[model samples]
Target: DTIKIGAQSMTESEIVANMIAQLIEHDTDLNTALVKNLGSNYVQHQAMLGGDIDISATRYSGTDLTSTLGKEAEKDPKKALNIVQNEFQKRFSYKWFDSYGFDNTYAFTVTKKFAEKEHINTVSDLKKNASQYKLGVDNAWLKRKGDGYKGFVSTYGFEFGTTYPMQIGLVYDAVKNGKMDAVLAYSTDGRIKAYDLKILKDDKRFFPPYDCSPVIPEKVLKEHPELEGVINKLIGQIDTETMQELNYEVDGKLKEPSVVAKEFLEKHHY
Candidate 1:
């Protein structure tokens, strides 16, 4: 039998799915395929609903952490994505979150030179004089109300005009090019290191926590009992630091993801 995993068309997601598929093929008689879809997370959601994939590698964390504990709650926790909740309740039980620290995907980052000159080490300082400088956030961040820059602003007491919004997807590049004064970026993203951008300390704790975890459908586990072992082996081994290193190996060192995942499993005695 063969197992299929789905992911975004992006290089990173495909690489991750490939890593898992290679591992399954190496360890068992079951053939594994990485199904790369050419759409965004929306497409991933569609795949999940259609049962086109047994497993998927994508982002599922939002501030509504309590949704996972719905059974213990009084109301239905209407704020959560119903499809995710339904999946958690019916198809697959909720697993643990991945070991990434900080729920806020993008960190408030500034240049070391700027930080030194302004003595700005935290978001509070940056917001204190909001009118002095401009901010750069992606279109998505500008629109989303929760877990977005808008959420951060609402948390604090700052606002940005339309002029402040920059359509710069390359966050570090925008900052480096002086196209915008400062930008939001992933805390563990390679671009932060590449651009030498200093992440502002979240002294006020404007962001929530984001942990990564695998959410596998129950049918897959039952039909292919080997999946439990696969998940357990992976969960125990993959942590925040390890994830960063795994990413570095493929993204930084330019090695194939399958090779890196194999090497990691071997070293970790999995």
Candidate 2:
């Protein structure tokens, strides 16, 4: 049977998942196929649990800790990883693999021109000028509790003149086209570079680390020990900068994900 891989509906996740499937098909006897553009993280996880998929190539530790495990967020990466690993293993019979060395954490971004005009370089700085601007955020960010709008506003002690809630995929373009003044963004999004947006610093440490890694089922891992070694070759290989560049190649340059994945593997001699 072919290994069924699940990928989120984002550029980075697709690239990573494609890379895993590419590597497995290249290096092993097993066949691989990707279920691309899965709707959301919850849907992807459910597919994995139900045996509809064999691999989740990109997952964030912070998201798992807060959303899936219903636990408080932690700043320390190792601690967060351990907590997620133990809980996921205990409850789901899944295995969390070594990290890809990238954390696609949250950020607030504005057009570079706007940032220059307003002198807003940090979230704290944004608080001072918030009254002068409107903020755009994804629906998910507005709905979450601790790290969402309420906690963020309470921690910063200020509110924007208005808040615009839109789909996560549209936030960057909205801010770029002047539809909104600021928007919440992911650190690894290719659009950040394509749109020339400036990310505000989270000086208060409000968000937790979001290191990305592959999570597979125990049955899959046990059936193919060689696959673990093949996948582990990717651990500690991709930092945030590398991920951003890889994403830009696909999203900005309009290159195919398969070509990008193959190039990345060749460059790393994988």
Candidate 3:
């Protein structure tokens, strides 16, 4: 049976999914299929539970904490990972593998021009003129717990003059066009590089870390024990900078995920 790997409809997610697919095919006797372009870890979780997917290419700690596990968000990265690992195993018989040494997290960003002009190197730095700035973010981010806008406000003791809860797809360009002074963007998003947006430092560590990792079913591991070691090969291999570069190649550079994945694995001599 071909191992079905699930990826979100995200450039970063697709890049990692392709890597997993190619790695399995290259290293083991097992065949693999790409169940590509699904949305949300919550959606992927349902697919895994429905046996439509054997492996989820990327599962993030911050996202799944509220979405899948229905638990309050945890600010501590290590503790969040522990909760994910333990709860996933107990609740769904799935393994939340160790992180790939990166966090594709939520970060407040502004255009490099704005950052330099204001000398805004950190989140707190934005506060002096918060009343003059408009912030853009996806609607859910403003509502969610622990590191959402509410949490951020409580932690930072400030709020933007206006917050536009728009579609996440439009946020990057929104900030670049000056339609919004700043936006919440994914830390590893190619758009940040494409738009030359500087990620404001989360000096207060308000946002929960969204550490990336693969998720696999225990039954699949039992069925093909070698898959355990094969999947673990990715751990500690790709960090934030590496992931952002890969994302830039696919999203900013318009390369196919498969091509990018193969080149990455080949360069690493995997």
Candidate 4:
């Protein structure tokens, strides 16, 4: 039998969908057919509902929580996770698997070289030299409430020497060219890999977590009882930086998503 996997019209989901396709084929006798570039999580959600696909390569809690479940965003990551898991299983009739280690949320990023030189791994760790780092960010994020710069300062208890509010793309360029010491970036953004940026950990969980997991229909699980174990092989394996590298291989380096997936699965011996 074959499993139909759905992916969104984005680099991260495309790479991940292909990864699950390769994993199912490599470890199990089951064949996989991939449906790439589905519009969004909503499209894939409908696909699962319609039986058009058997699995969703990646489903984020933040996106589906408010969009699919019609609920407000929960700041606490754990609470958000519980809400998504319970509601999705009960209403949507799909299995919401555990995260694959990384969450695709807003993150503060620095050049990989700088992170290594300064040994900065977490956002809280930036406190020591906070007064010296110039941060490049967009106006929306800077002025937005809750997760805004004001909230960040209050939570982290420190402020950068300067904050330049600019377009998101410009922020990426500035950080790469050394104009900005650090910038707010999407955790799984391929540009993070394109610019060789390192995503610092949110030790205090200032931003909400969008935990990505491989979701499948309950009917599919019963059809192939071994599917869970094969799928579980991929969970908690790829971290945020690892996902960025994979997306860059597809978007920046011009590698095929299938090739990227094969390399990742083989590297991890999955």
Model 2 residue 4 CA deviation in Å: 1.3
lDDT string for model 4 (135-201, tens) is: 9887688787666788899999999998988866576778888889999977787787677678888
Candidate 1 to native Cα RMSD, angstroms: 4.9
Error of 1 at 128 (Å): 2.7
RMSD to truth, every model: 4.9, 1.8, 1.8, 4.5
Model 1: pairs clashing at backbone N, Cα or C within 3 Å = 97-212, 98-211, 98-212, 98-213, 102-210, 103-209, 103-210
Highest-lDDT candidate? 3
Give the number of colliding residue pairs in candidate 2.
0
Tens-digit lDDT track for model 2 on 76-160? 8999999999999999888887689998988989888988898888988887767878888877777788888889888888888
Query: Scored by CA lDDT, what does every candidate get?
Result: 0.61, 0.87, 0.89, 0.85
Clashing pairs in 2: none
**Candidate 2 overall Cα lDDT vs. reference?**
0.87
Task: Report the lDDT tens digits of candidate 1 across residue range 144-209.
Answer: 655566667777777643324554346667777776677876654545655678888777655554
Candidates 1 and 4 compared: the better one by TM-score is: 1
> What local lDDT score does residue 248 receive in model 2, on the 0 to 100 scale?
90
